[PDB]
Amino acid sequence: KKIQYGAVASGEKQTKAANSIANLALIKTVLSRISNKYSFATKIIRVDGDDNYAVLQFNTEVTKQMVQDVSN
Amino acid sequence: QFDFRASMHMLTSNLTFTVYSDLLAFVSADTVEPINAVAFDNMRIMNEL
Numbered sequence: 001k002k003i004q005y006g007a008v009a010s011g012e013k014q015t016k017a018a019n020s021i022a023n024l025a026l027i028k029t030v031l032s033r034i035s036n037k038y039s040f041a042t043k044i045i046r047v048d049g050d051d052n053y054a055v056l057q058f059n060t061e062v063t064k065q066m067v068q069d070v071s072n
Numbered sequence: 073q074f075d076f077r078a079s080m081h082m083l084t085s086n087l088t089f090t091v092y093s094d095l096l097a098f099v100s101a102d103t104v105e106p107i108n109a110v111a112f113d114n115m116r117i118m119n120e121l
Binding site: 059060061 | 102
């Protein structure tokens with residue numbers, strides 16, 4: 001069975017040096033679109049393949065609604 | 073004796089309040105960029121190179 005699969009190939013030499021590019025350059029974009037509603041100032045964006053975190057520092061104290069409306 | 077007419081009273085208070093306990097939940101402070109952080113004299117702290 002020959003299945004067409006044009007996506008990324010986990011198993012190249014490239015599979016970790018370009019999972020840290022393609023995931024940093026993705027989350028640098030999705031952190032730009034949520035700044036139309038909440039104005040913040042991001043501090044670090046650490047990325048490890050898929051698994052990444054990105055600390056956001058706000059103006060006010062973080063409440064139970066800014067956590068819910070960023071996760072949404 | 074329970075003299076009724078001499079024992080009523082008119083209790084005068086207000087109509088409505090809105091009691092707020094904590095006040096610094098309203099302001100939202102910021103900080104300028106810490107390389108432009110100014111001491112009590114108007115040069116900057118950690119100025120040297």
